[PDB]
Every structure is written in structure tokens, then in C-alpha cells.
Amino acid sequence: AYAQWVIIIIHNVGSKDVKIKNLKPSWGKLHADGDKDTEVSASKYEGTVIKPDEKLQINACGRSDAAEGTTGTFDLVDPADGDKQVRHFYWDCPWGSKTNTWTVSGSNTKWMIEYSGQNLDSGALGTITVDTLKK
């Protein structure tokens, strides 16, 4: 259902380019900003280079009237280091469960990734701002 939703805002707060790769929704769909009725494909964002002080916004929700939510993964990669993984992200805003998941993993010490705005308890995962900085 549309009630299972997340908005991911990736803001490059550093001075070096970051890139999005392997954007893979596994449940639900991606949609246009402020418009859940307009499906957008992952290819719209796949490989986008986020330059210093730019943002990239991804909107994901459960399919219309479906007893299923939104789940997926993506990577942030370093385009200046042969697309070396920066961090791996996993999101889940499931239908008929009070627990959402937002997991960030990885081991690239040249980067600092901060996130906030998530809601793990009941209803939507919310609007998550992910700030990226290459140290």
C-alpha cells in the first residue's frame, strides 16, 4: 500500500563526487517526487554522480492497495576509486508490521556517512537524509 513509504535524500556535503549504484527495490515501487501514482524506474537514478552540494531524492512505496510494502537496497560508490563501495543501504517499510528497517553497512574509511529522519516504529520509514563526505 502507499502508506508503506520512504523518501531517501542523498546530500553530498563533501568536496568529492559520490555515486549511486545497484539501486534494487525488491518490494513495492519507486515513484516521482510527491506523486505515488507515477512509477519511476531505478534506471532514472542508477549510476547518478552526486556532485558536491547536490542532492538526489528517491521515493519508494508499496504498490497500490497491496498487502505489501517497500523494501530495497542501493550502494553509494566512489567514482574516483573504480566505483569502490562507500556504503551499502537496506530499507524495509513492511505492510502489516510495526517494525521498519534502515541498515547502513560498509568499511570504506575515506568516507563519512551520516543519516537521520528515519522512523523504525510503526507506519512509514519517513524522510531519511543521508549526508556523504569524503574525508
Numbering used by the authors: 2 to 136
Pull text from the paper.
The 1.85 Å X-ray crystal structure of PlyA revealed a β-sandwich fold, unexpectedly related to the actinoporin-like family of pore-forming toxins. Previous studies suggest that actinoporin-like proteins interact with membranes via one end of the β-sandwich, with the N-terminal sequence responsible for forming the pore. However, PlyA lacks the proposed actinoporin N-terminal transmembrane region consistent with the observation that PlyA binds membranes, but is unable to form pores on its own. However, in the crystal structure of PlyA, we noted two different V-shaped dimers (termed N-dimer and C-dimer) in the asymmetric unit. Both forms fitted adequately into EM density, placing either the PlyA N-terminus (N-dimer) or C-terminus (C-dimer) in proximity to the membrane surface. We tested the orientation of PlyA by adding a hexahistidine tag to the N-terminus, which abrogated membrane binding of PlyA to red blood cells whereas a C-terminal tag had no effect on binding. Also, mutation of Trp 6 (W6E), located in the PlyA N-dimer interface, reduced membrane binding and led to 100-fold lower pore-forming activity.
To gain further insight into the structural conversions in pore formation, we chose pleurotolysin (Ply), a MACPF protein consisting of two components, PlyA and PlyB, from Pleurotus ostreatus. Previous studies have shown that PlyA binds membranes and is required to recruit the pore-forming MACPF protein PlyB to the membrane surface. PlyA and PlyB together form relatively small and regular pores in liposomes. The membrane attack complex/perforin-like family (MACPF) proteins form the largest superfamily of pore-forming proteins identified to date.
